[PDB]
Each structure stands twice: as structure tokens, then as C-alpha cells.
Nucleic acid binder design. Structure first.
Ligand SMILES: [Mg+2]
Lengths: 289, 257, 120, 223
RNA sequence: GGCUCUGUGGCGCAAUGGAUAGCGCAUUGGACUUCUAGAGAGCAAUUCAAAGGUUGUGGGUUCGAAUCCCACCAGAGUCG
């Protein structure tokens, strides 16, 4: 077998660095301060600006999430059942995320990962705190939840949304001179082409499944103050998640997902090597202008 | 030499120094997909995990600076030692943080002294939750990960052997040999963005489109890409490899006639 | 028309490309007021081309009329680049040409294709 | 069924029986008579100037527009140097000239039967545009793509759509203040490829518009 | 009926004993880019700045309370 590669140990913070992290200003340094150039002419000013921007970026990416162990609601990772069980009582996020069953406060995998990223909880596995790398590795697979799905989940939660996992001659012209009276009359006579909608005849395709399936239900940020888990109501939009390389959903997929969604707008959550491109197909009836 | 843990064809970098080396030395910047520590609830500036493209990983492995390793799996031969070390580390952090908090409080009280005295005169005359822990963005322990073979298609590297990846890798290698910076251009309607320098300070000019030679080009797609480049002040730049070990480009622009 | 039969006197390609070339010639001459446009052909690819002058005293500019309903593999693009370079008198300038796509309503859009890189 | 909104069609800051005759030359349609051109571009805004940008103030009708005029209205009769063509022969000739003419004409008929005046979206990279009340008055609001599928949703993709192409078209139509609409055309799967020769198959055809609009995750955060 | 949790700018949130109570989205202004049948659009053609407050109300501890403690007001989850 090939030799074994030893990945080096990550960064470990100290007490001084932790305290400095907790005294940080949440002001984001501006990306590439000043307008953007268009031709590299070698001017020392350009080199100085590049040095400044790069040093800012490296000082930014070298920061570690630091949180107090009074608001870090502990949690445990259960791979067999396939969720996360909270040891301590939950917090504000419990008004919109997680579910209670069997008498315990249990979190889904993607929700637990998002909370770990935001510093809301302190995830564990076999009595060891999971870093974000190990959490990405374990909680994100082809069985529990993909990587693109978690990407979109975390994005929409960072914006402040509520994303809840989905739970189901012989041939003649069409017109003759004797029927040209009003624009609407003609525009209806020559309208033999009958329009439809995405769900029309959408019941007979759920059997033809495979590929793209709805994932999440999205409630806007404003609906976070008064959110009822048991009776949340009609979500803002149901979310399907794909990749930029994967093929565009065919009309079969559109009809199937629209029927499986109902009166909720459909949204697709493309990922292109990190970028997120929430395009949304939506049925549309062109008004008879 | 660096390391890029690969899993399900996803190259991610969890070290700041690795990204610093990639962007400066090897002219590869990639994209960030994590959440920023100093503010997690914004999407303007994201976190550490660098989502290197499959080509950006294959090429970096093909030049002798990146060793694609497969994501390790839990090993039951180290859990007791890990638990002991973690308990010792947490106790050490508890003690040090308590001491530092006490000293900081004492210093601030000394600074506000005589003002506390003025307040008290004007009045009379008339730690567990404090502990701080790091939610590390990378493994705090070293792991032994088996290297990755990227010339043979596998489950952790499903790219090798496919045409859509080989063509893009060839075009990426040829455009990177010329010192350009490269980035994905899904939003701009192309497979790459070509920057004359670091994309932080400089714009881009070319919106690449990695077309296979024999693959038919729909003229509507070409026209849309050209107009998009015009509206963004960029020139559509078709790319394609050739059997003679050479790549030919064709800068498509809009003639203001 | 003199130039219409000039394009149609070379017996190259199909009728659609001949008419596309006639439209592109008409445009580039009677709309942009180019100094002079001369018809050309290309039996090597059943193709038609036009060579004209943007400004008096300046160099020539190749044109490659195209209908929207025609595929264009990048190999065909390289072939036409080399053909245009041969038509340009074989100068040292990078190969280039014009791709005046044409729909059935005579709409014309010009996207010049140049070998190598060309900044905006 | 979350029917998409009908964002108001913006206006331009500035502004401003007879049997027609067209001649099919070089696999293209042409109109020569002056008054015929004036009525064709004024009373409906059909075609484009022979050499000008929009109007012939110094007319070549596209395939879809000419076929619509002959079939849906019966005013235009295309010719081939001696021959008044018939609607079936027009279908066949225009399919031979362009293999994917049936789909585009069906979409054109559907959109123009709703009062919108469509034009070619070549400049923006699409198949049809939609000017409300005419090009001069309103800025076109819809850039239309067209496809075809059967009742089982399986057919020959007229124009393959990778997410790159859709992203590019959406960005272009956003920058020019337009909506990118897909116009999937659905046909019975039990229809043989012999009825397509006649144009009456449309009556059995079913249209499905899908407004593909970008969703900026930050702007739709609340209302 | 009991128990747990929540309340900070229009919205999502940081700060959880001491500076100016701050960050993003949003809004309003600058600079630039394109606009060809596009005042707009602007997403590595993008890039900057300002303003925005009942910190749920009341009381207490304390020299300062959004930080801690009580009374309650509204809201969510669980049990019975
Ligand atoms: Mg709030």
C-alpha cells in the first residue's frame, strides 16, 4: 500500500488568544479597500494595496470561533438513530429549530452543524468535542444530508430565515374575416393552444421518482418572532437543492416537485464550487393584454 | 508541501496557512464556504474552508505542492488517550482563563479607582459560565490519512476518466501556466474567470468557456455569453484542447458597429 | 445586383449563407459607411467571406456571414481564423474575423473572434 | 401553484381587408411593397427593417412571424417565385429550412395570441421577446426560451440548457430589465409523427410557461 | 396547572458588570461599469459612507445593569 500521509494538527488557541477573540470588534474589514484596478502595471501602489488586502484576509481567516461555556448548550451525536440529542436545555433557536420526541430535545444533523458554526452549541461524539472539520465529515454524508444541502441550509439560516426539513385546401387559417370584431375575440379564437400549470397532471409522476426531491421549507425572517412549530402554517418557499454541474431539472421534475409542494413557491439552490445561486422556477399565466 | 482532505470529490482546506500559500505562491485562491467567526449571520465574507475545484486539486497535486489525502475515519485505538488529553486541556484552559479574567478585572478596577471612590462618596454622603472554549474549524489532533490516487476513478475521486473534468483540467492547466488567477464563473455564464492578478484588487477580463473541439456550440449560447461579457466589461474567451498537446483560445468580443 | 451574383457566382455553400453574406455586405456598407467591401469565397469549407476596409488608408477586415441555425465547432472557428489570415495578406497581426450572425428577420449582430487574448 | 407575479411593464422614457404578399428568397421571407410594410410594422409591429434597426425608414419577416401571419391571421401568402404556397407546404418548407421550427412557431402563436407583440431575442441570446403594445412604447419585459416534450415529458431538447446557460441568460435579462421565461411545449405522447405534418396538432398541444427568476436571498428576507 | 426557554435599531443578531450598545440584510447618499430594440441593472464591475434604540415594563443589589436578582406582560416547547 502507499505510504501514510500525516495531516498536521490544526490551530490550538490559548487563554490570551481566546480572551482577545471575545473582545473582538465585529466590524468586517472591507474587501479590497478602494475601487478595483483593471490592468497590473507593476506600480508600487498596486503592490502595497495587494499586500494590505492579503494581510487583512489572512488575519481574518485565522480567527477561531470563541464562545462562553454558559451559552454553549451541550449536545451529543447519535449516528445510529441519526440525530443530535441536547444535554442542556435549548435557547432561542429552539423556537425555530429542533424537535422534541420521547421526552428529549433532539436536533437534526444539518441544524446541529449550523448551530456549531454559529457557536450556539458544543457538539460531542463519544465524549469528544467535534470541530467543524470533523462535523463536516461525519454529519454530512449521502445518508443523512449532503454537503450542498448543508451549504444552502447554513446560508439561509445565516440570513435569518427559518428552514425546516420537508415532511410529506383541407387546412385553413385559424382566423377568418368574419370573426375579427374585438382584440379579445380574435386573441381567444386563435388561442387554441391550451395553457397548463406545473401541478396539472402532477399526481401520476411521484412514481417516476429519482434525482431531484424537495428538501426544506423556508419561512421568512419576519416570521421568526412568532413561530409555531406545531402549527407553523404555509411556508414562504419549499427548497430543492442541486449543483451547477448537474443537469437542469426537466419539466417532469418541475411538475413532480410543484405537485409535491402545492401552493408554496419552489426554489432551487444551485451550488457552483461554493457560490450559491438560488434560482426559482414559478408557474406563470401570461395575462391577456 | 500541503494536504487537501478529499471526500466524495470535495477538496477542502482547513488551514489559513495553506490558503495563504495557495493564493500567493501557486496562484490559486479557490472559494470560502464556511461561516465567519466574527459574525456568523452575514454572507458578505465567509469562513475558512476553501472549496478548491476538482481541477484546482488535481493540478496542485500534479505539480508537487498538494498531497490529496482521503478523509480519515474514526479509529478506536486512541479514544481513551484523546479523552485524557482533552480533560487535561480543558482543566488547563479553566485555570488560565480564570486567572486572566481575575487580572483583567483587577486592572480595570484599578483604572476606574478614585472614580469608584467619587461615586461611592456621592452615594453614601447623599466561574463556570465565564469559561471560554474554542469551536475549532480544523481537527486539533493529527491524523494518519491514506493518500489519494487521482488517476483512477474511485468513490472519493469520481472525477478521473470523465470528459467534462479532463477537458476543464486541461484548459485550467493551460490558463494557469500563463500566470493568471482563475475562479469559477457559474454566475457569469462560463467555467472560469481569468484575472490578470489577485482577484481581490484586480477585475477580470476573460469569461472562459471550456468547449470541446468537436462539441457543437449553439450560437445563441455564444451570443448570450458575449453580451454578458460586454455588460460586465469582459471578453468571452472560448477554450479547447487539441490532440497535439496544445490549447487554442478565441477571444469573442462585441464590435461596437 | 452586381455583388449578389458575385457572391453567388463562386458556387460555394448553400443559398442561405449567400443571402446572409448579402445582408452583411449591405449592412457593413450602407449603414457603417465602411470605405469599401469586396466579396470573397472559401471552397475549402463551403464558406463565404467578405473583405472590406473600416477607414480609408487603414487595413482590411474579414467578415464571416453566419445563420443562427448553423453549428460552429471550435475547430471550425480555427479553420476560419486561418482562412481569414490567408485573406488578410498574411500580416503579423493575430488572426481575426467577424461573425455577423443573421436571423430570418435580417437582424445582424457582430461578434469579432480573435486568436489569442484580446482585452476589453 | 404559486403563480409568479406580473411586475409592471415599464414604459419608454421617450416615445415615437387586404391580402399581403411576401416572397420566399434564399430560404428567407421578404416583403417589398411600401404600404404593406407600413401596415405590417405599424398595425402589429411585424418584421424588421431590411437595412435599418427597427423600421424601414431609410421588410423581412422571420419564419415564425410569416407563418403566424399566413396561418393565425390569413392575411399573408408566401410565394416561391411562381407559387402561392399552402399552410402544410409552409410547415414542411420552414421545417426543412430550420429543423426546429415547429416548436418556435407554436410558442410564437401562443404568446402572440395573448396580445403581446414578440420579437427575436437574438441580441440577448433567446428565441423570442415580448413587447407590450409594441416595441416603441414599452420596454420588452420577457425573454423567452422554447423547448418541446411529450405527455410523458421526454423529447428532443431543442436547445440544451446547462445551468451556465440559464445563469447567463438570467443575468443578461436582469441587466436589461427583463424576465427570463421558459415556454415548454407539451404534446400527447400517443400522437404519431405524421400529424405534425399538418399544423392542426397545436389544438392537442399544451403550453407551460415557467418564469425563471433569480431569488436574491438577502432582498427577500422580509416584507 | 406545573416546568424549561425567548424578549437588544424595521428584520436576524453581538456585546452578558465599565469607551460611542455595536455587525449584516434592509433604507438613503458617493464613486465607477454596461446598457444594442435598456431612468434602470450592478452577483469577484464592483467598491465606499451615513442615519437608524422604550435593551418588555416595574423594583432591588451595586459607584455604572442590555449584563445579576425578584414581580409581573407577551411568545414558544414539554408534561399532564
Ligand atoms: Mg430582533
Amino acid at each position: 500500500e502507499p505510504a501514510a500521509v500525516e495531516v498536521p494538527a490544526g490551530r490550538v488557541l490559548s487563554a490570551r488568544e481566546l480572551f482577545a477573540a471575545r473582545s473582538r470588534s465585529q466590524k468586517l474589514p472591507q474587501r479590497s479597500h478602494g475601487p478595483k484596478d483593471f490592468l497590473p502595471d507593476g506600480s508600487a501602489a498596486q503592490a502595497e494595496r495587494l499586500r494590505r488586502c492579503r494581510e487583512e484576509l489572512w488575519q481574518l481567516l485565522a480567527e477561531q470561533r470563541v464562545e462562553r461555556l454558559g451559552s454553549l448548550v451541550a449536545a451529543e451525536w447519535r449516528p445510529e438513530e441519526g440525530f443530535v440529542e441536547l444535554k442542556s436545555p435549548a435557547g432561542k433557536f429552539w423556537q425555530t429549530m429542533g424537535f422534541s420526541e420521547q421526552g428529549r430535545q433532539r436536533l437534526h444533523p444539518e441544524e446541529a452543524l449550523y448551530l456549531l458554526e454559529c457557536g450556539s452549541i458544543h457538539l460531542f461524539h463519544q465524549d469528544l468535542p467535534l470541530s467543524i472539520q470533523e462535523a463536516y465529515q461525519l454529519l454530512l454524508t449521502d445518508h443523512t444530508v449532503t454537503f450542498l444541502q448543508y451549504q444552502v441550509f447554513s446560508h439561509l439560516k445565516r440570513l435569518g430565515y427559518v428552514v425546516r426539513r420537508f415532511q410529506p385546401q383541407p387546412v385553413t387559417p385559424l382566423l377568418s374575416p368574419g370573426q375579427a370584431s374585438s382584440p379579445a375575440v380574435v386573441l381567444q379564437h386563435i388561442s387554441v393552444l391550451q395553457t397548463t400549470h406545473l401541478p396539472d397532471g402532477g399526481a401520476r409522476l411521484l412514481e417516476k421518482s429519482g434525482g431531484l426531491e424537495i428538501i426544506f421549507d423556508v419561512y421568512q425572517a419576519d416570521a421568526v418572532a412568532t413561530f409555531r412549530k406545531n402549527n407553523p402554517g404555509k411556508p414562504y418557499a419549499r427548497m430543492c437543492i442541486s449543483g451547477f454541474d448537474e443537469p437542469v431539472p426537466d419539466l417532469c421534475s418541475l411538475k413532480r416537485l410543484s405537485y409535491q409542494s402545492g401552493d408554496v413557491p419552489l426554489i432551487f439552490a444551485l451550488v457552483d464550487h461554493g457560490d450559491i445561486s438560488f434560482y426559482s422556477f414559478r408557474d406563470f399565466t401570461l395575462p391577456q393584454d | 508541501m500541503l494536504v487537501v482532505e478529499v471526500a466524495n470529490g470535495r477538496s477542502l482546506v482547513w488551514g489559513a496557512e495553506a490558503v495563504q500559500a495557495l493564493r500567493e505562491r501557486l496562484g490559486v485562491g479557490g472559494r470560502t464556504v464556511g461561516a465567519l467567526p466574527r459574525g456568523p449571520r452575514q454572507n458578505s465574507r465567509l469562513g475558512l474552508p476553501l472549496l478548491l475545484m476538482p481541477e484546482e486539486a488535481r493540478l496542485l497535486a500534479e505539480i508537487g505542492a498538494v498531497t490529496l489525502v482521503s478523509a480519515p475515519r474514526p479509529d478506536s485505538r486512541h479514544h481513551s488517550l484523546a479523552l485524557t488529553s482533552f480533560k487535561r486541556q480543558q482543566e488547563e484552559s479553566f485555570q488560565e482563563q480564570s486567572a486572566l479574567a481575575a487580572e483583567a478585572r483587577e486592572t480595570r478596577r484599578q483604572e476606574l479607582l478614585e472614580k469608584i471612590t467619587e461615586g461611592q462618596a456621592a452615594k453614601k454622603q447623599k466561574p463556570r459560565s465565564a469559561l471560554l472554549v474554542q469551536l475549532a474549524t480544523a481537527r486539533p489532533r493529527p491524523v494518519k490519512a491514506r493518500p489519494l490516487d487521482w488517476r483512477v476513478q474511485s468513490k472519493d475521486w469520481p472525477h478521473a476518466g470523465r470528459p467534462a473534468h479532463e477537458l476543464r483540467y486541461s484548459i485550467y492547466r493551460d490558463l494557469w501556466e500563463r500566470g493568471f488567477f482563475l475562479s469559477a464563473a457559474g454566475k457569469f455564464g462560463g467555467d472560469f474567470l481569468v484575472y490578470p492578478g489577485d482577484p481581490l484588487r484586480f477585475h477580470a477580463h476573460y469569461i472562459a468557456q471550456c468547449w470541446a473541439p468537436e462539441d457543437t456550440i449553439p450560437l445563441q449560447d455564444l451570443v448570450a455569453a458575449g453580451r454578458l461579457g460586454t455588460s460586465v466589461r469582459k471578453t468571452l474567451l472560448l477554450c479547447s484542447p487539441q490532440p497535439d498537446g496544445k490549447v487554442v483560445y478565441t477571444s469573442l468580443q462585441w464590435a461596437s458597429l | 445586383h452586381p455583388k449578389y451574383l458575385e457572391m453567388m457566382e463562386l458556387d460555394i455553400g448553400d443559398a442561405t449563407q449567400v443571402y446572409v453574406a448579402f445582408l452583411v455586405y449591405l449592412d457593413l456598407m450602407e449603414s457603417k459607411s465602411w470605405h469599401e467591401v469586396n466579396c470573397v469565397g472559401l471552397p475549402e469549407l463551403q464558406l463565404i467571406c467578405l473583405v472590406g476596409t473600416e477607414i480609408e488608408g487603414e487595413g482590411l477586415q474579414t467578415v464571416v456571414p453566419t445563420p443562427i441555425t448553423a453549428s460552429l465547432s471550435h475547430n471550425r472557428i480555427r479553420e476560419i481564423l486561418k482562412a481569414s489570415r490567408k485573406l488578410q495578406g498574411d500580416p503579423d497581426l493575430p488572426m481575426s474575423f467577424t461573425l455577423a450572425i443573421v436571423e430570418s428577420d435580417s437582424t445582424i449582430v457582430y461578434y469579432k473572434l480573435t486568436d489569442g487574448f484580446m482585452l476589453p | 401553484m404559486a403563480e409568479a407575479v406580473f411586475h409592471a411593464p415599464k414604459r419608454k422614457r421617450r416615445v415615437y381587408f387586404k391580402i399581403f404578399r411576401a416572397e420566399m428568397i434564399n430560404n428567407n421571407v421578404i416583403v417589398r411593397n411600401a404600404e404593406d410594410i407600413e401596415q405590417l410594422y405599424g398595425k402589429g409591429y411585424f418584421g424588421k427593417g431590411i437595412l435599418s434597426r427597427s423600421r424601414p425608414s431609410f421588410l423581412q419577416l422571420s419564419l415564425e412571424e410569416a407563418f403566424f401571419l399566413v396561418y393565425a391571421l390569413g392575411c399573408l401568402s408566401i410565394y416561391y417565385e411562381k407559387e402561392p404556397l399552402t399552410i402544410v407546404k409552409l410547415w414542411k418548407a420552414f421545417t426543412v429550412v430550420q429543423p426546429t421550427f415547429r416548436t418556435t412557431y407554436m410558442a410564437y402563436h401562443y404568446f402572440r395570441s395573448k396580445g403581446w407583440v414578440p420579437k427575436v431575442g437574438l441580441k440577448y441570446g433567446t428565441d423570442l421577446l415580448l413587447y407590450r403594445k409594441g416595441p416603441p412604447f414599452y420596454h420588452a419585459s420577457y425573454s423567452v426560451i422554447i423547448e418541446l416534450v411529450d405527455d410523458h415529458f421526454e423529447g428532443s431538447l431543442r436547445r440544451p440548457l446547462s445551468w451556465k446557460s440559464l445563469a447567463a441568460l438570467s443575468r443578461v435579462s436582469v441587466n436589461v430589465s427583463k424576465e427570463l421565461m421558459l415556454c415548454y411545449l407539451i404534446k400527447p405522447s400517443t400522437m404519431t409523427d405524421k400529424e405534425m405534418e399538418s399544423p392542426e396538432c397545436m389544438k392537442r398541444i399544451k403550453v407551460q410557461e415557467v418564469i425563471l427568476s433569480r431569488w436574491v436571498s438577502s432582498r427577500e428576507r422580509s416584507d
